[PDB]
Nucleic acid binder design. Structure first.
Length: 183
DNA sequence: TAGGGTTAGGG
């Protein structure tokens, strides 16, 4: 049994009329659901327009994710790896991005190093090992862009990532402005 | 479109 957090998906953009039942009836087509709930206002019962579905295994999570686009109750919804409550506190933790910030990589890190670890998560479109402007000095971090945002989500939910023989920190990339706005 | 009475004691 893998962790509950890794077996759960956030389902955004739910129709006003989606219920635990209708939601379950839809996502169960890809596996056994161990939890399925629609979040609604605790005071007015009004649906908050999002919910969660949890499968018995992450493989079933991947199957469902490979079944995108998902249309539930006539509304195109948006399934997403569930970000823990703790990580949801982080800036931009819920953004739909294709690029990840990879920090703490050795100076001699080369593109193949990044590929031997990240390709497993999805198609890589761009790899950028950052260096200093005019200096040429390696700055110790890189950006990797994938063709699917879920490849990023699958990555950022994991705690450790080994590149060029050592652990590195991987986060969703924030723009120059988002960074400055979260600072 | 980010969580369901789900987050720092008392020795």
């Amino acid at each position: 049994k893998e962790p509950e957090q890794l077996r759960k998906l956030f389902i955004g953009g739910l129709s006003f009329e989606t219920t635990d039942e209708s939601l379950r009836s839809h996502f169960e087509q890809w596996g056994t659901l161990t939890d399925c709930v629609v979040m609604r206002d605790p005071n007015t019962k009004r649906s908050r327009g999002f919910g969660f579905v949890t499968y018995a295994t992450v493989e079933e999570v991947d199957a469902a994710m490979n079944a995108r686009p998902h249309k539930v109750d006539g509304r195109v919804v948006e399934p997403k790896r569930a970000v823990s409550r703790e990580d949801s506190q982080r800036p931009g933790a819920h953004l739909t991005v294709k690029k990840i910030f990879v920090g703490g990589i050795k100076e001699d890190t080369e593109e193949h190093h990044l590929r031997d670890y990240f390709e497993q998560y999805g198609k890589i479109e761009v790899i950028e090992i950052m260096t200093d402007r005019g200096s040429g000095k390696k700055r110790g971090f890189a950006f990797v862009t994938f063709d699917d945002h879920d490849s990023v989500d699958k990555i950022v939910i994991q705690k450790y990532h080994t590149v060029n023989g050592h652990n590195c920190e991987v986060r969703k990339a924030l723009s120059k402005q988002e960074m400055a706005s979260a600072s």
